[PDB]
Amino acid sequence: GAMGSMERASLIQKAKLAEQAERYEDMAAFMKGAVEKGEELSCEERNLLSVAYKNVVGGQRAAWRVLSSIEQKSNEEGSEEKGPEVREYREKVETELQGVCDTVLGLLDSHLIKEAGDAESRVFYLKMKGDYYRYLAEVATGDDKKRIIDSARSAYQEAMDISKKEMPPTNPIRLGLALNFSVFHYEIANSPEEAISLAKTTFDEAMADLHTLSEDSYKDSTLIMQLLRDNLTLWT
């Protein structure tokens, strides 16, 4: 890594600057360098890592969907052969997306997850692991698509087991995990009934725990509860 010569604290400071400048590829490289210093990450630092790569892969996923849509139109009845360009370029973006996902998964595996003992850190990293296998699954078609889906499911499931044991039902990490696992069920696993049941049970159990929260925690939890409600409205 080109970041080996820079102080950990400077990498974190520059990641925050890159976020302000909306330079998310820089931000991801800075946070990758910070992870490779080998120390565990604080709550704030975990968020910086997640925000950086989510923006990077988010742009790649959006581009992949545009190109995949063009490619599928070109392969219809009554279509005019445009050459291999659309497929070739979709493949390029797809390969670049898979590289980013592999990089994130490599950071989690070496060695963020194995050193994460607290529920807040371990659930956070395992949710990330499920997310980036889910992004790999979105573009997967070959011999390994089933194995990629199972890798996503296994990470989400371990994270769910820990969060139900160790976190209250309104914990924002627990809520966001259930939200994304429900999206996994609906969009990846062809299990819309599991997706709806998880979102509904998550929402209802959070609703019954809101009375325990401060004004600020209430705002944090109800924000994610609304996202669960938005999905249920779309799915039913």
């Binding site: 704030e44 997640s50 925000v51 989510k54 939200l179 999206v183 969009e187 938005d230 999905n231 799915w235």
Partner: peptide, 9 residues
């Protein structure tokens, strides 16, 4: 169907 947006810390 929306996952956690999570693009602003």
């Amino acid at each position: 169907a929306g996952s956690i947006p999570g693009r602003r810390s």
